[PDB]
Structure 1
């Protein structure tokens, strides 16, 4: 697994051709966006919730947006 640090790197990671799906896991303290690429599972950790909600609608279309809750 790989941990994506800032928001921008996650966007073009999710826009890759080998990105199979993105999973959103809502914990008590953070929201994790996990995109399943060919080699690695890229996880982006968002501390707050407004940025997590903003990222939810900005995801590329045609990609599975499975919610883990």
Structure 2
């Protein structure tokens, strides 16, 4: 698995056709994990900020399959 530290990188990989699905994981420390299943790697972005979390979630392309915890 790969960790992505850049939000726009996460969007770019999500835009790429190899992206298959996305998971949003809400942890007990109010930190969210945006995980993106690609052909080769599970790309994970750890967003500790709430406001950046849902603007990213609405930033995700509508065609992509986003799934709850």
TM-score (norm 1): 0.94
Aligned CA RMSD, in angstroms, stands at: 0.7
- Give unmatched runs, 5+ long, in structure 2: none
1 or 2, which has the higher helix percentage?
Answer: 2
* Structure 1 outlier segments of 4+, above 2 Å: none
2:26 is aligned to 26
2:37 is aligned to 36
2:50 is aligned to 49
- Give unmatched runs, 5+ long, in structure 1: none
What is the alpha-carbon distance in structure 1 between the residues aligned to residue 52 and residue 19 of structure 2? 22
TM-score (norm 2): 0.94
Aligned residues: 68
